[PDB]
mmCIF file of N, CA and C and ligand atoms in Angstrom:
data_model
loop_
_atom_site.group_PDB
_atom_site.id
_atom_site.type_symbol
_atom_site.label_atom_id
_atom_site.label_comp_id
_atom_site.label_asym_id
_atom_site.label_seq_id
_atom_site.Cartn_x
_atom_site.Cartn_y
_atom_site.Cartn_z
ATOM 1 N N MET A 1 0.862 -1.210 0.000
ATOM 2 C CA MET A 1 0.000 0.000 0.000
ATOM 3 C C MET A 1 0.873 1.226 0.000
ATOM 4 N N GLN A 2 0.327 2.323 -0.526
ATOM 5 C CA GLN A 2 1.092 3.572 -0.645
ATOM 6 C C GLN A 2 1.318 4.196 0.730
ATOM 7 N N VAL A 3 2.404 4.958 0.823
ATOM 8 C CA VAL A 3 2.853 5.476 2.090
ATOM 9 C C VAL A 3 2.886 6.990 1.977
ATOM 10 N N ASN A 4 1.916 7.635 2.617
ATOM 11 C CA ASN A 4 1.793 9.093 2.480
ATOM 12 C C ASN A 4 1.028 9.665 3.630
ATOM 13 N N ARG A 5 1.509 10.811 4.089
ATOM 14 C CA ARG A 5 0.757 11.620 5.021
ATOM 15 C C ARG A 5 0.432 12.922 4.353
ATOM 16 N N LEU A 6 -0.783 13.396 4.578
ATOM 17 C CA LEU A 6 -1.192 14.653 3.986
ATOM 18 C C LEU A 6 -0.536 15.819 4.722
ATOM 19 N N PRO A 7 -0.336 16.924 4.014
ATOM 20 C CA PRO A 7 0.248 18.104 4.659
ATOM 21 C C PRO A 7 -0.765 18.746 5.615
ATOM 22 N N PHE A 8 -0.270 19.633 6.463
ATOM 23 C CA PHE A 8 -1.137 20.422 7.330
ATOM 24 C C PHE A 8 -0.561 21.816 7.460
ATOM 25 N N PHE A 9 -1.443 22.784 7.626
ATOM 26 C CA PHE A 9 -1.028 24.160 7.825
ATOM 27 C C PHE A 9 -0.478 24.371 9.232
ATOM 28 N N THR A 10 0.462 25.302 9.351
ATOM 29 C CA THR A 10 1.034 25.612 10.675
ATOM 30 C C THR A 10 0.826 27.064 11.108
ATOM 31 N N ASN A 11 0.252 27.903 10.256
ATOM 32 C CA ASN A 11 -0.024 29.277 10.676
ATOM 33 C C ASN A 11 -0.986 29.332 11.844
ATOM 34 N N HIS A 12 -0.647 30.131 12.847
ATOM 35 C CA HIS A 12 -1.535 30.264 13.993
ATOM 36 C C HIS A 12 -2.839 30.975 13.670
ATOM 37 N N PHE A 13 -2.840 31.805 12.636
ATOM 38 C CA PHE A 13 -4.048 32.533 12.298
ATOM 39 C C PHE A 13 -5.226 31.663 11.918
ATOM 40 N N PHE A 14 -4.979 30.432 11.489
ATOM 41 C CA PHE A 14 -6.069 29.511 11.193
ATOM 42 C C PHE A 14 -6.924 29.218 12.435
ATOM 43 N N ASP A 15 -6.352 29.421 13.618
ATOM 44 C CA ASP A 15 -7.091 29.205 14.861
ATOM 45 C C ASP A 15 -7.588 30.490 15.501
ATOM 46 N N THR A 16 -7.209 31.630 14.935
ATOM 47 C CA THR A 16 -7.689 32.922 15.403
ATOM 48 C C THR A 16 -8.329 33.634 14.218
ATOM 49 N N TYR A 17 -7.609 34.579 13.631
ATOM 50 C CA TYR A 17 -8.082 35.330 12.475
ATOM 51 C C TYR A 17 -6.855 35.969 11.887
ATOM 52 N N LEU A 18 -6.985 36.407 10.637
ATOM 53 C CA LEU A 18 -5.938 37.160 9.967
ATOM 54 C C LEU A 18 -6.426 38.597 9.910
ATOM 55 N N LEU A 19 -5.650 39.503 10.489
ATOM 56 C CA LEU A 19 -5.969 40.918 10.464
ATOM 57 C C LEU A 19 -5.234 41.565 9.305
ATOM 58 N N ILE A 20 -5.983 42.326 8.522
ATOM 59 C CA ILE A 20 -5.416 43.083 7.413
ATOM 60 C C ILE A 20 -5.989 44.495 7.504
ATOM 61 N N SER A 21 -5.118 45.498 7.595
ATOM 62 C CA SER A 21 -5.564 46.888 7.625
ATOM 63 C C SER A 21 -6.281 47.249 6.324
ATOM 64 N N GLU A 22 -7.375 47.991 6.426
ATOM 65 C CA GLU A 22 -8.084 48.434 5.235
ATOM 66 C C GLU A 22 -7.234 49.417 4.416
ATOM 67 N N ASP A 23 -6.165 49.936 5.016
ATOM 68 C CA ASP A 23 -5.231 50.800 4.303
ATOM 69 C C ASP A 23 -4.093 50.014 3.666
ATOM 70 N N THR A 24 -4.258 48.694 3.581
ATOM 71 C CA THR A 24 -3.286 47.862 2.916
ATOM 72 C C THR A 24 -3.369 48.100 1.415
ATOM 73 N N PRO A 25 -2.252 48.535 0.811
ATOM 74 C CA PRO A 25 -2.239 48.774 -0.620
ATOM 75 C C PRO A 25 -2.448 47.513 -1.462
ATOM 76 N N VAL A 26 -3.163 47.652 -2.567
ATOM 77 C CA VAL A 26 -3.236 46.559 -3.530
ATOM 78 C C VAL A 26 -1.820 46.213 -3.992
ATOM 79 N N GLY A 27 -1.570 44.904 -4.090
ATOM 80 C CA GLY A 27 -0.238 44.361 -4.361
ATOM 81 C C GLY A 27 0.582 43.952 -3.156
ATOM 82 N N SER A 28 0.137 44.339 -1.970
ATOM 83 C CA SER A 28 0.833 44.015 -0.724
ATOM 84 C C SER A 28 0.708 42.542 -0.416
ATOM 85 N N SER A 29 1.773 41.956 0.084
ATOM 86 C CA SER A 29 1.643 40.642 0.684
ATOM 87 C C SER A 29 0.955 40.813 2.026
ATOM 88 N N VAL A 30 -0.048 39.997 2.283
ATOM 89 C CA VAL A 30 -0.792 40.070 3.543
ATOM 90 C C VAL A 30 -0.461 38.939 4.523
ATOM 91 N N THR A 31 0.115 37.853 4.026
ATOM 92 C CA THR A 31 0.629 36.791 4.882
ATOM 93 C C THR A 31 1.433 35.825 4.024
ATOM 94 N N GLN A 32 1.987 34.802 4.645
ATOM 95 C CA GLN A 32 2.580 33.707 3.910
ATOM 96 C C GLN A 32 2.077 32.434 4.565
ATOM 97 N N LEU A 33 1.401 31.632 3.762
ATOM 98 C CA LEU A 33 0.917 30.339 4.218
ATOM 99 C C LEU A 33 2.119 29.447 4.495
ATOM 100 N N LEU A 34 2.043 28.710 5.601
ATOM 101 C CA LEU A 34 3.092 27.785 6.068
ATOM 102 C C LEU A 34 2.473 26.406 6.285
ATOM 103 N N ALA A 35 3.155 25.363 5.819
ATOM 104 C CA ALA A 35 2.660 24.008 5.975
ATOM 105 C C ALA A 35 3.812 23.032 6.134
ATOM 106 N N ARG A 36 3.486 21.862 6.679
ATOM 107 C CA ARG A 36 4.455 20.781 6.792
ATOM 108 C C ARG A 36 3.875 19.508 6.198
ATOM 109 N N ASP A 37 4.694 18.821 5.421
ATOM 110 C CA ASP A 37 4.386 17.490 4.934
ATOM 111 C C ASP A 37 5.391 16.542 5.602
ATOM 112 N N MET A 38 4.906 15.580 6.389
ATOM 113 C CA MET A 38 5.823 14.711 7.128
ATOM 114 C C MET A 38 6.677 13.818 6.261
ATOM 115 N N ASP A 39 6.287 13.655 4.996
ATOM 116 C CA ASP A 39 7.076 12.913 4.013
ATOM 117 C C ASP A 39 8.074 13.796 3.276
ATOM 118 N N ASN A 40 8.091 15.096 3.597
ATOM 119 C CA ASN A 40 8.882 16.092 2.862
ATOM 120 C C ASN A 40 8.470 16.213 1.393
ATOM 121 N N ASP A 41 7.223 15.861 1.079
ATOM 122 C CA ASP A 41 6.742 16.005 -0.294
ATOM 123 C C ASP A 41 6.622 17.475 -0.675
ATOM 124 N N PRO A 42 6.906 17.811 -1.943
ATOM 125 C CA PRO A 42 6.654 19.164 -2.442
ATOM 126 C C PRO A 42 5.180 19.548 -2.290
ATOM 127 N N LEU A 43 4.957 20.776 -1.876
ATOM 128 C CA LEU A 43 3.600 21.252 -1.586
ATOM 129 C C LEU A 43 3.186 22.400 -2.506
ATOM 130 N N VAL A 44 1.894 22.451 -2.825
ATOM 131 C CA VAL A 44 1.327 23.600 -3.522
ATOM 132 C C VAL A 44 0.206 24.208 -2.724
ATOM 133 N N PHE A 45 0.218 25.532 -2.672
ATOM 134 C CA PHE A 45 -0.715 26.311 -1.926
ATOM 135 C C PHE A 45 -1.707 26.950 -2.885
ATOM 136 N N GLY A 46 -2.901 27.188 -2.366
ATOM 137 C CA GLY A 46 -3.969 27.828 -3.141
ATOM 138 C C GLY A 46 -5.012 28.510 -2.304
ATOM 139 N N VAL A 47 -5.896 29.197 -3.016
ATOM 140 C CA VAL A 47 -7.088 29.802 -2.461
ATOM 141 C C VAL A 47 -8.257 29.282 -3.265
ATOM 142 N N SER A 48 -9.357 29.010 -2.570
ATOM 143 C CA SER A 48 -10.560 28.585 -3.277
ATOM 144 C C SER A 48 -11.730 29.469 -2.908
ATOM 145 N N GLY A 49 -12.645 29.599 -3.864
ATOM 146 C CA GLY A 49 -13.803 30.430 -3.739
ATOM 147 C C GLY A 49 -13.741 31.553 -4.729
ATOM 148 N N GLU A 50 -14.869 31.855 -5.339
ATOM 149 C CA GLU A 50 -14.961 32.939 -6.310
ATOM 150 C C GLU A 50 -14.571 34.299 -5.727
ATOM 151 N N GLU A 51 -15.186 34.698 -4.615
ATOM 152 C CA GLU A 51 -14.897 35.987 -4.002
ATOM 153 C C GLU A 51 -13.485 36.024 -3.467
ATOM 154 N N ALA A 52 -13.087 34.965 -2.768
ATOM 155 C CA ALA A 52 -11.766 34.920 -2.146
ATOM 156 C C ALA A 52 -10.699 35.114 -3.214
ATOM 157 N N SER A 53 -10.840 34.397 -4.318
ATOM 158 C CA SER A 53 -9.859 34.450 -5.405
ATOM 159 C C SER A 53 -9.810 35.818 -6.111
ATOM 160 N N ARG A 54 -10.909 36.566 -6.137
ATOM 161 C CA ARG A 54 -10.918 37.909 -6.704
ATOM 162 C C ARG A 54 -10.138 38.860 -5.818
ATOM 163 N N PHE A 55 -10.118 38.588 -4.511
ATOM 164 C CA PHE A 55 -9.460 39.495 -3.542
ATOM 165 C C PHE A 55 -8.034 39.110 -3.175
ATOM 166 N N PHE A 56 -7.700 37.832 -3.295
ATOM 167 C CA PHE A 56 -6.444 37.305 -2.762
ATOM 168 C C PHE A 56 -5.825 36.376 -3.780
ATOM 169 N N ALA A 57 -4.536 36.565 -4.021
ATOM 170 C CA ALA A 57 -3.750 35.719 -4.900
ATOM 171 C C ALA A 57 -2.720 34.969 -4.090
ATOM 172 N N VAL A 58 -2.500 33.691 -4.420
ATOM 173 C CA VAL A 58 -1.554 32.858 -3.681
ATOM 174 C C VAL A 58 -0.461 32.388 -4.607
ATOM 175 N N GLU A 59 0.769 32.507 -4.139
ATOM 176 C CA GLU A 59 1.926 31.964 -4.846
ATOM 177 C C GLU A 59 1.947 30.459 -4.558
ATOM 178 N N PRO A 60 1.858 29.617 -5.603
ATOM 179 C CA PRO A 60 1.629 28.214 -5.335
ATOM 180 C C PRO A 60 2.776 27.524 -4.622
ATOM 181 N N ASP A 61 4.008 27.983 -4.825
ATOM 182 C CA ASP A 61 5.167 27.324 -4.256
ATOM 183 C C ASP A 61 5.586 27.919 -2.921
ATOM 184 N N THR A 62 5.516 29.229 -2.795
ATOM 185 C CA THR A 62 5.993 29.884 -1.581
ATOM 186 C C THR A 62 4.893 30.103 -0.540
ATOM 187 N N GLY A 63 3.645 30.084 -0.982
ATOM 188 C CA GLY A 63 2.522 30.364 -0.083
ATOM 189 C C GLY A 63 2.300 31.828 0.249
ATOM 190 N N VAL A 64 3.048 32.734 -0.365
ATOM 191 C CA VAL A 64 2.793 34.171 -0.169
ATOM 192 C C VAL A 64 1.389 34.520 -0.684
ATOM 193 N N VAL A 65 0.665 35.384 0.033
ATOM 194 C CA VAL A 65 -0.685 35.782 -0.326
ATOM 195 C C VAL A 65 -0.664 37.294 -0.517
ATOM 196 N N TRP A 66 -1.145 37.743 -1.667
ATOM 197 C CA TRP A 66 -1.237 39.161 -1.998
ATOM 198 C C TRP A 66 -2.685 39.638 -2.148
ATOM 199 N N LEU A 67 -2.886 40.907 -1.790
ATOM 200 C CA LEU A 67 -4.166 41.601 -1.987
ATOM 201 C C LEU A 67 -4.327 42.058 -3.415
ATOM 202 N N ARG A 68 -5.432 41.665 -4.052
ATOM 203 C CA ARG A 68 -5.652 41.984 -5.470
ATOM 204 C C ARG A 68 -6.555 43.196 -5.717
ATOM 205 N N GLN A 69 -7.344 43.564 -4.705
ATOM 206 C CA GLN A 69 -8.354 44.620 -4.819
ATOM 207 C C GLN A 69 -8.375 45.400 -3.530
ATOM 208 N N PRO A 70 -8.802 46.673 -3.592
ATOM 209 C CA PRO A 70 -8.903 47.410 -2.341
ATOM 210 C C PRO A 70 -9.905 46.821 -1.338
ATOM 211 N N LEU A 71 -9.529 46.889 -0.064
ATOM 212 C CA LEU A 71 -10.400 46.547 1.036
ATOM 213 C C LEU A 71 -11.140 47.798 1.471
ATOM 214 N N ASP A 72 -12.280 47.602 2.117
ATOM 215 C CA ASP A 72 -13.018 48.720 2.677
ATOM 216 C C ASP A 72 -13.959 48.244 3.772
ATOM 217 N N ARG A 73 -13.576 48.495 5.021
ATOM 218 C CA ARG A 73 -14.364 48.032 6.153
ATOM 219 C C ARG A 73 -15.848 48.418 5.984
ATOM 220 N N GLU A 74 -16.099 49.581 5.383
ATOM 221 C CA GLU A 74 -17.458 50.067 5.118
ATOM 222 C C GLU A 74 -18.281 49.097 4.259
ATOM 223 N N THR A 75 -17.715 48.633 3.144
ATOM 224 C CA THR A 75 -18.443 47.726 2.232
ATOM 225 C C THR A 75 -18.434 46.280 2.736
ATOM 226 N N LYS A 76 -17.277 45.842 3.229
ATOM 227 C CA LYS A 76 -17.123 44.500 3.775
ATOM 228 C C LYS A 76 -15.983 44.494 4.787
ATOM 229 N N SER A 77 -16.339 44.226 6.037
ATOM 230 C CA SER A 77 -15.421 44.323 7.162
ATOM 231 C C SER A 77 -14.743 43.003 7.463
ATOM 232 N N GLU A 78 -15.211 41.932 6.812
ATOM 233 C CA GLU A 78 -14.784 40.556 7.097
ATOM 234 C C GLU A 78 -14.928 39.696 5.841
ATOM 235 N N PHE A 79 -14.029 38.723 5.700
ATOM 236 C CA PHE A 79 -14.139 37.693 4.682
ATOM 237 C C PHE A 79 -13.959 36.352 5.371
ATOM 238 N N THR A 80 -14.602 35.322 4.842
ATOM 239 C CA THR A 80 -14.232 33.952 5.196
ATOM 240 C C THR A 80 -13.658 33.346 3.940
ATOM 241 N N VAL A 81 -12.381 33.037 4.005
ATOM 242 C CA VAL A 81 -11.645 32.548 2.834
ATOM 243 C C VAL A 81 -11.163 31.137 3.101
ATOM 244 N N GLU A 82 -11.164 30.308 2.074
ATOM 245 C CA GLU A 82 -10.587 28.975 2.180
ATOM 246 C C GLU A 82 -9.212 28.937 1.515
ATOM 247 N N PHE A 83 -8.213 28.567 2.287
ATOM 248 C CA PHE A 83 -6.872 28.335 1.763
ATOM 249 C C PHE A 83 -6.615 26.845 1.720
ATOM 250 N N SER A 84 -5.832 26.411 0.733
ATOM 251 C CA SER A 84 -5.547 25.006 0.518
ATOM 252 C C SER A 84 -4.063 24.715 0.478
ATOM 253 N N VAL A 85 -3.702 23.492 0.872
ATOM 254 C CA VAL A 85 -2.351 22.982 0.674
ATOM 255 C C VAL A 85 -2.449 21.535 0.222
ATOM 256 N N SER A 86 -1.643 21.154 -0.754
ATOM 257 C CA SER A 86 -1.675 19.827 -1.345
ATOM 258 C C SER A 86 -0.306 19.233 -1.562
ATOM 259 N N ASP A 87 -0.217 17.907 -1.445
ATOM 260 C CA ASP A 87 0.983 17.181 -1.851
ATOM 261 C C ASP A 87 0.749 16.411 -3.132
ATOM 262 N N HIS A 88 -0.332 16.748 -3.841
ATOM 263 C CA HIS A 88 -0.721 16.096 -5.091
ATOM 264 C C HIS A 88 -1.408 14.730 -4.894
ATOM 265 N N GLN A 89 -1.403 14.183 -3.674
ATOM 266 C CA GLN A 89 -2.166 12.980 -3.316
ATOM 267 C C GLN A 89 -3.457 13.395 -2.588
ATOM 268 N N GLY A 90 -3.343 14.419 -1.781
ATOM 269 C CA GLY A 90 -4.477 14.941 -1.062
ATOM 270 C C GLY A 90 -4.351 16.421 -0.816
ATOM 271 N N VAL A 91 -5.475 17.035 -0.480
ATOM 272 C CA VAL A 91 -5.581 18.463 -0.228
ATOM 273 C C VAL A 91 -6.270 18.716 1.094
ATOM 274 N N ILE A 92 -5.720 19.639 1.873
ATOM 275 C CA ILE A 92 -6.370 20.191 3.056
ATOM 276 C C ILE A 92 -6.849 21.594 2.703
ATOM 277 N N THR A 93 -8.112 21.895 2.950
ATOM 278 C CA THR A 93 -8.680 23.220 2.735
ATOM 279 C C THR A 93 -9.228 23.683 4.062
ATOM 280 N N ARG A 94 -8.858 24.877 4.498
ATOM 281 C CA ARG A 94 -9.242 25.363 5.823
ATOM 282 C C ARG A 94 -9.801 26.755 5.709
ATOM 283 N N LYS A 95 -10.857 27.040 6.456
ATOM 284 C CA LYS A 95 -11.410 28.388 6.506
ATOM 285 C C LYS A 95 -10.614 29.303 7.434
ATOM 286 N N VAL A 96 -10.420 30.538 6.998
ATOM 287 C CA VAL A 96 -9.848 31.540 7.882
ATOM 288 C C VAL A 96 -10.722 32.775 7.826
ATOM 289 N N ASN A 97 -10.909 33.377 8.997
ATOM 290 C CA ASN A 97 -11.618 34.644 9.125
ATOM 291 C C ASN A 97 -10.614 35.758 8.886
ATOM 292 N N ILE A 98 -10.855 36.556 7.859
ATOM 293 C CA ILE A 98 -10.030 37.724 7.605
ATOM 294 C C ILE A 98 -10.782 38.949 8.110
ATOM 295 N N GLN A 99 -10.201 39.612 9.093
ATOM 296 C CA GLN A 99 -10.758 40.836 9.636
ATOM 297 C C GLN A 99 -10.136 42.032 8.932
ATOM 298 N N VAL A 100 -10.976 42.915 8.381
ATOM 299 C CA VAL A 100 -10.509 44.169 7.762
ATOM 300 C C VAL A 100 -10.489 45.273 8.817
ATOM 301 N N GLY A 101 -9.287 45.703 9.202
ATOM 302 C CA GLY A 101 -9.112 46.616 10.332
ATOM 303 C C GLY A 101 -9.112 48.087 9.949
ATOM 304 N N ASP A 102 -9.697 48.915 10.814
ATOM 305 C CA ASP A 102 -9.637 50.367 10.682
ATOM 306 C C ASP A 102 -8.591 50.894 11.671
HETATM 307 CA CA1 CA B 1 2.835 13.674 1.886
#
């Protein structure tokens, strides 16, 4: 039988929230996704969801996440975004609460 463990995220924000200032410029990195694969398998990171993907771009290899559009606490003060990590055998997708700060 095949021998594989799926990756898991290690960012603490997955258990709290990710704070991003509403004055964060478009193009800014807002975090870097971190994960461990116990087999040391190469990992790819992603974002899923139509809205999430319009607002946030993920570097598949490094896990850096950039803001694609302006934030505005007035229009939307919070997002629930799903981030993913895969070893090509399986994928973990986790929700994170993104708080837009004033
Ligand atoms: Ca693995």
